Amino acid sequence: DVGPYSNLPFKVKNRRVPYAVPHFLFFAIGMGIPFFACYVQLKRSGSI
Amino acid sequence: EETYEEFSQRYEKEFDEAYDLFEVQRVLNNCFSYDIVPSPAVIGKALNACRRVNDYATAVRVFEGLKHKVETKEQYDAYLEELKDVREELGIDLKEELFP
Amino acid sequence: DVPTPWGIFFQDSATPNMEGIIELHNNIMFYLVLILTFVSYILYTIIYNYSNATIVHKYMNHGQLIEIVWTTLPAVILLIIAFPSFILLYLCDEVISPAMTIKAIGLQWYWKYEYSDFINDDGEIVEFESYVIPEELLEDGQLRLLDVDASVVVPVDTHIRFIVSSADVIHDFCVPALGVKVDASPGRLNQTSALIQREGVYYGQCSELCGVMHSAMPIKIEAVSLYEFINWLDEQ
Amino acid sequence: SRKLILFIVFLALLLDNMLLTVVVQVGLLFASKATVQLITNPFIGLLTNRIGYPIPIFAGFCIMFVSTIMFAFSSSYAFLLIARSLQGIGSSCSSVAGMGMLASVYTDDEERGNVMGIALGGLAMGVLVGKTAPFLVLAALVLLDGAIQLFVLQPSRVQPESQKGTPLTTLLKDPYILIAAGSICFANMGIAMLEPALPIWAFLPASISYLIGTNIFGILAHKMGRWLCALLGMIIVGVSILCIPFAKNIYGLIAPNFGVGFAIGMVDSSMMPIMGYLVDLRHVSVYGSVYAIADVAFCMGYAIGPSAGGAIAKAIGFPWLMTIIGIIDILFAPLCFFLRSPPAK
Amino acid sequence: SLTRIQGSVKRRILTDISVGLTLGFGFASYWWWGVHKPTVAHRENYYIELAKKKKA
Amino acid sequence: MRIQNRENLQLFPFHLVTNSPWPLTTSLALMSLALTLGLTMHGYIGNHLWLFLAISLVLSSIFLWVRDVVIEGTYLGDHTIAVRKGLNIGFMLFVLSEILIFAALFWSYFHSAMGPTIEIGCQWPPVGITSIKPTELPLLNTIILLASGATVTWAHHSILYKDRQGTLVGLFITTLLIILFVGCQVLEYTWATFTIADSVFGSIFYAGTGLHFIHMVMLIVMLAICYARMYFYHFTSNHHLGLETTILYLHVLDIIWLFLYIVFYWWG
Amino acid sequence: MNYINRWLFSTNAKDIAVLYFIFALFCGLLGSIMSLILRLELSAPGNQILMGNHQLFNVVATAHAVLMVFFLVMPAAIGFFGNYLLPLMIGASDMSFARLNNISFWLLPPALVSLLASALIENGAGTGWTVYPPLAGVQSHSGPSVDLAIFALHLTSISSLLGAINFITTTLNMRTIGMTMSKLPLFVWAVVFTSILLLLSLPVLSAGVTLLLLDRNFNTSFFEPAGGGDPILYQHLFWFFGHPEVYILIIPGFGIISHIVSTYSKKPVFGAIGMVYAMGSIGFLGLLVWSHHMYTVGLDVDSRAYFTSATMVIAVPTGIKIFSWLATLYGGSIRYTTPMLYAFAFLFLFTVGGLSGVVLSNASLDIAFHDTYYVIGHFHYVLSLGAVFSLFAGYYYWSPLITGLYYNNNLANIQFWLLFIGTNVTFFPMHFLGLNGMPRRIPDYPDAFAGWNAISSFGSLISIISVILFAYVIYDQLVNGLTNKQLSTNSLFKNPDFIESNIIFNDNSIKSSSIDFLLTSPPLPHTFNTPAIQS
Amino acid sequence: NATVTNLEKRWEDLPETDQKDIISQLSERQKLPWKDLTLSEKKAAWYISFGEWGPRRPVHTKEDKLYIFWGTVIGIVISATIFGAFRYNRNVPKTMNREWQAASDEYLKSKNAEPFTGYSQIQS
Amino acid sequence: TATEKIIELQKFYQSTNKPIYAAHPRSKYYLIPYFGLLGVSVAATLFYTGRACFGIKD
Amino acid sequence: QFKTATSIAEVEGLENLVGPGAKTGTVPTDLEQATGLERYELLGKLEGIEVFDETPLEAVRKGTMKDPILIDSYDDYRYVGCTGVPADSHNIEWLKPTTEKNARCWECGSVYKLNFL
Ligand code: HEA
Ligand SMILES: [Zn+2]
Structure with missing residues (x-):
């Protein structure tokens, strides 16, 4: 089964949910973690 | 270290023994990759080497590289007033007389 | 002196050491501008002549004369740079007779100044503390995050020796115009020297990190004449 | 203004060892350095009483500077021998006057061993050392710093020394100075006649063990006791040098080499300030001549070794030669128990 | 004659180094003779003027 | 390479390891050791019996590596x-x-x-x-x-x-x-x-x-x-x-x- | 079960490099968002996004340093390009110790958990990247926050050491039939020279961190001056690690650049032996200087002169590399494809990033520039503009070979130009702010420094749009990437020559100087069955 | 003549089984002595081997550089409109007003500061 | 048989059809407690590192 | 697991290389305890046959179409690095010859053919 979609850990074609949702959620979590950390540490220290 | 008079004997010997189109284009490709331009004797052997292998486009592309290797325009026109009996006997036409 | 809004270059000098620093920087920038322009011109020539070229020189790959030229020519630049650096390192310091001593102890988020001379028989040594004037209590025309309540007042044309230490964490005594930057680690005494040639006011800020209010702990140095210094010592 | 002298001495011994180790009928060419260094060394010890210390150092730097470049154009055999000559002279000047200057400026005996342990580490980077163009630039910059301190910032006269020293004749009659030089002789006897003889029958383990050992025992030899360090180091020299005939493989020769250059690096670093201690205790305090004796007893081995090594190798063979040089290394050591306390004055 | 050409790239290299150094030295002789020295002159003329006022 | 039946054996003298689960488990034991050591010195846990389990699991994981490196040398015979x-x-x-x-x-x-x-x-x-x-x-x-x-x-x-x-x-x-x-x-x-x-x-x-x-x-x-x-x-x-x-x-x-x-x- | 025995319980070297790439993108996204949070606080004077809290500003700066020095550049330049390519260049099947490669990957996901939990469970760990001793005590930072951040520098250290020993023991005895160690490619030499410094540099950092931990929690008084210790000791025990570290990030970039200059300019590299000796000298002279970071601590005057001398000497070997790259680019034919533009943008921005360090190497000139934004403007031209472009050029160079899917040329060029413009806008006025006297690690600044802080906050929003466009480039590579090889001739590795016909060129397409670009492009799991042969 | 004339407009559209017959029919006409070839065959034999088709296409066409330039312009415009929104909504402290930066100039004039290049704290 | 089972267990580890770490009929005693206690050790440091985020001490 | 070999003519796999047993009370030798690719190398070095070759490529004669250099492989492809007929003139160019096509080395011109063993 050696081919151009064989060495990736994730499936790209012939899939139920389209690939745009797993691709977008990765970057969304990666850009949304250090805002959650700042929100928690702002709310723990008095300020809004 | 190599001199003009050994360059222009080694490449004549190497042009007089090619047997396929790959070898003619191989020797032609590394001949135009030095600081020395080819002599009129070497280019005279290259056209017969193209004739034995029966190719036409390579005998025109030889004359197109002389426009880019040579520094000025007068030296280029000095190359075509000695290589004229070779052209009009074999039948080679330049690119700027074809307009392809 | 004060920072200017759209600054490009150094602040104005008031000490021979800062003038030496400026002169050495302007000496090094000569050779650095020369090297950058050489590299830029060769890149321009490579782009302008040899882009999408029919003829490839694939046998010019050794070099023997040219490899010595880009090894010895950068060396001579290093020796020419290294001569005035060593002279300025060794020359300009307290060679002869310092005349005052000011001890600057760096606490957590404010400065403490003592003048080690002017001692009475009972230990009446003059001392004060420099804090930060907050934004709410500023008067009309004062500088924000640089203005203090009490300023260090010194005479002109007198060698001043600063002995700097600290009691909590590592600080940094920095007055940019005067050319003074020395650390304050909690277990040793560091010393620097300054000479001021003209009257005025000089502002500075700390450098090494100390915690929450690292950004608000400035230094302010006023340089009065000798008569005003005598009148100021007889009030404190 | 004391650490820069240590830097200058370290660089001078580095250039010494690099010029000695790098060699370019080969025994006539190779033994030209140490033969001239055997003769030139007592003369500088008397010259520094007249002219002073820094001028022979920087004059020797100038002589090696424009003689190594003259060696490059040299092709004929007479020109090669006259090129290796005066390279030996400049090396001798730099070494003797630099060690005299370090003995002069460092008065305390405890600090002197700590300084000379770091200073003697330069006789391993000559064997070890790459590109070698950046390191020469670094050496030139440190020499600019030395010239700026000593010749530009403060101007000085010719300045003869304040006290006339003892002559060289009465110092060779002192027994303890002879015993001190005998260790530096006999430790290098074992290591001199091995590298010319090794292609007939390594540099990196010896250099690494030397540079590790001398720095730590230069500090430790005061409270550990200098004569105990000399005994322990010379016995390790003998036991390590006997084990080479038993080994018959190149991979098995790595372990004795860490035996040798370590222990030699001990027996130098404990025995080299003790001569200054002997001169300070028994005679007047002039340091040039006793360290000239040190350089003589150190560099005679490289002259005598490669010449006699082939003759003894043709005579008796390699395990016999290694065994007798091990016997020579071990059997001199019980004399060093005489270093407990000299007669005072 | 016009049919013997032997070296072309070497002269290009020699011209391409002997222009990138003159241009660099031109762009470095303006930082030291048009940006540096008049500032030192202005700094000195300020200090030869402040002392005279205190003298008078 | 001209021995008669040569294609039935390996053509290079190096080891191709089988798939093993131990690198993941050593890392998961070191995570527990790091977090419990960072917490127990400042309160937050109290009992000292979790840190000891973390140390014991790190040591047992190393020993379980060693078991598989012994069998591949004296039993399987690839060294x-x-x-x-x-x-x-x-x-x-x-x-x-x-x-x-x-x-x-x-x-x-x-x-x-x-x-x-x-x-x-x-x-x-x-x-x-x-x-x-x-x-x-x-x-x-x-x-x-x-x-x-x-x-x-x-x-x-x-x-x-x-x-x-x-x-x-x-x-x-x-x-x-x-x-x-x-x-x-x-x-x-x-x-x-x-x-x-x-x-x-x-x-x-x-x-x-x-x-x-x-x-x-x-x-x-x-x-x-x-x-x-x-x-x-x-x-x-x-x-x-x-x-x-x-x-x-x-x-x-x-x-x-x-x-x-x-x-x-x-x-x- | 086949998913677990090939992507969790792994042995193959090429199947772990993809997991390094996926981890590296995540940890490079987190720090970029933290840098944007920093840059919208330093926009105009006052207290804008963080309301009054000067904590959660130093915490954000520390977590920006650690996540993109230790979790982005090293996993990309050691895992994705070192593990994948070096056995293919030297011709080995797999590495010598495969389980050590697996553990060297798997110690990093639970190294991320400790750092992300070190920013939540108290006010935080605002010690800076260099965790200086008397601020990191029990009197200022009292809780499990600095402890959980100094256990994240242990697991990364163990991973790097285990990778380095594998890289040295692979290249010594797992070569092909006729490769002696003077015919190796330049990237292998770069990996070897970094793996020696990783052996010689990590124990002293481990000793310093462990001694700090013992001072904090078991009151040993190594670094407290009330029992007979000095803080300055820690500084030595940090910076002996600190200066080799900044070369470990930059040497694997150089070799990558060399390959690009070899291929899109159809010439061999000018003096390869000069390049390997220059790399050796740069690696050796990075251990003999470590104290130019401490010129204001109170050193002697005969020690400043040695450390000013030993730092400027490193200009001599780097100039050999720069002029050799120019001499390689000089005679040949140049086509401007998307790795080649990054290669051209590295030869001009690294040299303006490195010439400022000759100004900072002097002990006389460092008393005007220390802890001032000139240092930050220095090291962003050589970190963000020297190493990140090397990583991008390596990705755009090797991704069609590894994956088998091509990428759009136009969108990659738009990404490159946006990154160039924005990153050059951000990092240049820091030099002016440094010359005027702005200190480091301050949330609020005086009113004079406002204007340039308005311009340096404009380029960050240009670069993050370039990051989002890079995300879309990866998406357009993976989906419909089979039809992006006929749009442009960027897919071709080499242009036909002047006399080489198209009919001959289609039969003989790939001419290479390594084993890499002759493989099938998905590479096989077991690539070499019979050994490769070399004259 | 139709198979040979005007191959500059049809060569990239033919399949790969009608391309290997034109080459295999001009390779048996070039064995004849030249001057016996038509002009169209001389043009076609040049366009087949040394011509701007296939692997001799340029990397950047004229209609691609406009696309890259206009991708960069709307890459800069969006960041400007994002940054403008974080500029109207700012905390402006009391010190950044012109009537506060004009009173500080009198203090810096009384205590002589920046006698060189200039002092002016006014930036509105 | 005798102490030389080395010429018997070298015919068992090859030709097994099971992985090497679970081939002998003794590896159950090594693999059940280790994988059992690892799932308690990891589940104990994920309960106390979420409880530390909410401020609860013991 | 089967009949033990004595020399390498009777080795048809990994099944003929288990060996006999040592005796109780003696340190066993390497002819009595070895199974895999260790005993195969040991059984080759006791005869003079190197199982794992380390001989570089031929650099004596050039290569034409009529008389090409024959490279031996157990697969359909073998990676070949050419550095010239004087053996250091041609720079390192890698080639993939197969059983349907011959490599031709664009600078010097050597031809390589497969011998499928
Ligand atoms: C990762 C990139 C990188 C690299 C490669 C280097 C290497 C070098 N660094 Fe290092 N440096 C850092 C990043 C890097 N550094 C960082 C992040 C710090 C820590 C800062 C902090 O903690 O706050 C640091 C530390 C640091 C400092 C301490 C900063 C301080 O004062 O607070 C200094 C200056 O003294 C310095 C300068 C140099 C120099 C001169 C080089 C040289 O190796 C580079 C040499 C380059 C050239 C010289 C270009 C050569 C080009 C030519 C065309 C040749 C011309 C020849 C001549 C110049 C003669 N670096
Ligand atoms: Zn070839």
């Missing part, structure tokens, strides 16, 4: 001349990194000893802190270490002349001469008059002689797995890579102890 050379190069480049931790601790002592501060009145081993005399029990440790360095040579010289009773005895006597070093160095920590916290001198002495203790428990384990693997006939007379690594590991620790005895116990 050619190249792979043994690779493992030796590997072990030397770990011993080298093991030495350079001690050089930092040696430099952290000479930077404080030579140049002492104001707060301590300038004197090594300082006032009120009695050091450990070097003409006592710290001599017997040096004697038993140089004896143990000579007993392992009689163990490697009896496996080359094909003597079985004479390889078991040397390893047994060596394992009993390393347990006594640990026993002497644990009775010298209960009869001492200076603690971890009361100086900078009691900070480096219990941090240069505490890492050595942990490095010497590993030798007791390593010679246990060299006696027990020799009793059950795993070692031949020219293929024994367990003895050669433990001999190189004993001698380095002996040389380190002879530098841990001159600078801390004698020099002051």
Whole structure:
């Protein structure tokens, strides 16, 4: 089964949910973690 | 270290023994990759080497590289007033007389 | 002196050491501008002549004369740079007779100044503390995050020796115009020297990190004449 | 203004060892350095009483500077021998006057061993050392710093020394100075006649063990006791040098080499300030001549070794030669128990 | 004659180094003779003027 | 490459490892150790029985690696001349990194000893802190270490002349001469008059002689797995890579102890 | 079960490099968002986004340093390009110790958990990247926050050491039939020279961190000056690690650049032996200087002169590399494809990033520039503009070979130009702010420094749009990437020559100087069955 | 003549089984002595081997550089409109007003500061 | 048989059809407690590192 | 698991390389305890046959179409690095010859053919 979609850990074609949702959620979590950390540490220290 | 008079004997010997189109284009490709331009004797052997292998486009592309290797325009026109009996006997036409 | 809004270059000098620093920087920038322009011109020539070229020189790959030229020519630049650096390192310091001593102890988020001379028989040594004037209590025309309540007042044309230490964490005594930057680690005494040639006011800020209010702990140095210094010592 | 002298001495011994180790009928060419260094060394010890210390150092730097470049154009055999000559002279000047200057400026005996342990580490980077163009630039910059301190910032006269020293004749009659030089002789006897003889029958383990050992025992030899360090180091020299005939493989020769250059690096670093201690205790305090004796007893081995090594190798063979040089290394050591306390004055 | 050409790239290299150094030295002789020295002159003329006022 | 039936065997002398689950489990044990060690020193857990489970799982994971490296060498039979050379190069480049931790601790002592501060009145081993005399029990440790360095040579010289009773005895006597070093160095920590916290001198002495203790428990384990693997006939007379690594590991620790005895116990 | 035995319980070297790439993108996204949070606080004077809290500003700066020095550049330049390519260049099947490669990957996901939990469970760990001792005590930071951040520098250190030993023991005895160690490619030499410094540099950092932990939690008083210790000791024990570290990030970039200059300019590299000796000298002279970071601590005057001398010497070997790259680019034919533009943008921005360090190497000139934004403007031209472009050029160079899917040329060029413009806008006025006297690590600044802080906050929003466009480039590569090889001739590795016909060129397409670009492009799991042969 | 004339407009559209017949029919006409070839065959034999088709296409066409330039312009415009929104909504402290930066100039004039290049704290 | 089972267990580890770490009929005693206690050790440091985020001490 | 070999003419796999047993009370040797690719190398080195070759490529004669250099492989491809007929003139160019096509080395011109073993 050696081919151009064989060495990736994730499936790209012939899939139920389209690939745009797993691709977008990765970057969304990666850009949304250090805002959650700042929100928690702002709310723990008095300020809004 | 190599001199003009050994360059222009080694490449004549190497042009007089090619047997396929790959070898003619191989020797032609590394001949135009030095600081020395080819002599009129070497280019005279290259056209017969193209004739034995029966190719036409390579005998025109030889004359197109002389426009880019040579520094000025007068030296280029000095190359075509000695290589004229070779052209009009074999039948080679330049690119700027074809307009392809 | 004060920072200017759209600054490009150094602040104005008031000490021979800062003038030496400026002169050495302007000496090094000569050779650095020369090297950058050489590299830029060769890149321009490579782009302008040899882009999408029919003829490839694939046998010019050794070099023997040219490899010595880009090894010895950068060396001579290093020796020419290294001569005035060593002279300025060794020359300009307290060679002869310092005349005052000011001890600057760096606490957590404010400065403490003592003048080690002017001692009475009972230990009446003059001392004060420099804090930060907050934004709410500023008067009309004062500088924000640089203005203090009490300023260090010194005479002109007198060698001043600063002995700097600290009691909590590592600080940094920095007055940019005067050319003074020395650390304050909690277990040793560091010393620097300054000479001021003209009257005025000089502002500075700390450098090494100390915690929450690292950004608000400035230094302010006023340089009065000798008569005003005598009148100021007889009030404190 | 004391650490820069240590830097200058370290660089001078580095250039010494690099010029000695790098060699370019080969025994006539190779033994030209140490033969001239055997003769030139007592003369500088008397010259520094007249002219002073820094001028022979920087004059020797100038002589090696424009003689190594003259060696490059040299092709004929007479020109090669006259090129290796005066390279030996400049090396001798730099070494003797630099060690005299370090003995002069460092008065305390405890600090002197700590300084000379770091200073003697330069006789391993000559064997070890790459590109070698950046390191020469670094050496030139440190020499600019030395010239700026000593010749530009403060101007000085010719300045003869304040006290006339003892002559060289009465110092060779002192027994303890002879015993001190005998260790530096006999430790290098074992290591001199091995590298010319090794292609007939390594540099990196010896250099690494030397540079590790001398720095730590230069500090430790005061409270550990200098004569105990000399005994322990010379016995390790003998036991390590006997084990080479038993080994018959190149991979098995790595372990004795860490035996040798370590222990030699001990027996130098404990025995080299003790001569200054002997001169300070028994005679007047002039340091040039006793360290000239040190350089003589150190560099005679490289002259005598490669010449006699082939003759003894043709005579008796390699395990016999290694065994007798091990016997020579071990059997001199019980004399060093005489270093407990000299007669005072 | 016009049919013997032997070296072309070497002269290009020699011209391409002997222009990138003159241009660099031109762009470095303006930082030291048009940006540096008049500032030192202005700094000195300020200090030869402040002392005279205190003298008078 | 012109042997008749050659395609039925491997054409290169290197090892292709089967899939193993141990690198993930070692990392998951080290996560538990790191988080519980970071928490239990500041409250937040209370009971000290989770940190002990983390240490026990790290050690059992390492032992489970070692089981699979033994079976692939004495049972499956994939250790050619190249792979043994690779493992030796590997072990030397770990011993080298093991030495350079001690050089930092040696430099952290000479930077404080030579140049002492104001707060301590300038004197090594300082006032009120009695050091450990070097003409006592710290001599017997040096004697038993140089004896143990000579007993392992009689163990490697009896496996080359094909003597079985004479390889078991040397390893047994060596394992009993390393347990006594640990026993002497644990009775010298209960009869001492200076603690971890009361100086900078009691900070480096219990941090240069505490890492050595942990490095010497590993030798007791390593010679246990060299006696027990020799009793059950795993070692031949020219293929024994367990003895050669433990001999190189004993001698380095002996040389380190002879530098841990001159600078801390004698020099002051 | 086949998913677990090939992507969790792994042995193959090429199947772990993809997991390094996926981890590296995540940890490079987190720090970029933290840098944007920093840059919208330093926009105009006052207290804008963080309301009054000067904590959660130093915490954000520390977590920006650690996540993109230790979790982005090293996993990309050691895992994705070192593990994948070096056995293919030297011709080995797999590495020598495969389980050590697996553990060297798997110690990093639970190294991320400790750092992300070190920013939540108290006010935080605002010690800076260099965790200086008397601020990191129990009197200022009292809780499990600095402890959980100094256990994240242990697991990364163990991973790097285990990778380095594998890289050295692979290149020594796992070569092909006729490769002696003078015919190796330049990237292998770069990996070897970094793996020696990783052996010689990590124990002293481990000793310093462990001694700090013992001072914090078991009151040992190594670094407290009330029992006979000095903080300055830690500084030495940090910076002996600190200066080799900044070369470890830059040497694997150089070799990558060399390959690009070899291929899109059809010439061999000018003096390869000069390049390997220059790399050796740069690696050796990075251990003999470590104290130019401490010129204001109170050193001697005969020690400043040595460390000013030993730092400027490193200009001599780097100039050999720069002029050799120019001499390689000089004679040949140049086509401007998307790795080649990054290669051209590295030869001009690294040299303006490195010439400022000759100004900072002097002890006389450092008393005007220390802890001032000139240092930050220095090291962003050589970190963000020297190493990140090397990573991008390596990705755009090797991704069609590894994956088998091509990428759009136009969108990659738009990404490159946006990154160039924005990153050059952000990092240049820091030099002016440094010359006027702005200190480091301050949330609020005086009113004079406002204007340039308005311009340096404009380029960050240009670069993050370039990051989002890079995300879309990866998406357009993976989906419909089979039809992006006929749009442009960027898919071709080499242009036909002047006399070489198209008909001959289609039969003989790939001419290479390594084993890499002759493989099938998905590479096979077991690539070499019979050994490769070399004259 | 139709198979040979005007191959500059049809060569990239033919399949790969009608391209290997034109080459295999001009390779048996070039064995004849030249001057016996038509002009169209001389043009076609030049366009087949040394011509701007296939692997001799340029990397950047004229209609691609406009696309890259206009991708960069709307890459800069969006960041400007994002940054403008974080500029109207700012915390402006009391010190950044012109009547506060004009009173500080009198203090810096009384205590002589920046006698060189200039002092002016006014930036509105 | 005798102490030389080495010429018997070298015919078992090859030709097994099971992985090497679970081939012998003894590896159950090694693999069940280790994988059992690892799932308690990891589940104990994920309960106390979420409880530390909410401020609860013991 | 089967009949044990004595020399390498009787080795048809990994099934013929288990060996006999040692005796109780003696240190076993390497002819009595070895299974895999270790005993195969040992059984080759006791005869003079190197199982794992380390001989570089031929650099004596050039290569034409009529008389090409024959490279031996157990697969359909083998990676070949050419550095010239004087053996250091041609720079390192790698080639993939197969069983349907021959490599031709664009600078010097050597031809390589497959011998499928
Ligand atoms: C990762 C990139 C990188 C690299 C490669 C280097 C290497 C170098 N660094 Fe290092 N440096 C850092 C990033 C890097 N550094 C960082 C992040 C710090 C820590 C800062 C902090 O902690 O706050 C640091 C530390 C640091 C400092 C301490 C900063 C301080 O004062 O607070 C200094 C200056 O003294 C410095 C300068 C140099 C120099 C001169 C080089 C040289 O190796 C580079 C040499 C380059 C050239 C010289 C270009 C050569 C080109 C030519 C065309 C040749 C011309 C020849 C001549 C110049 C004669 N670096
Ligand atoms: Zn070839």
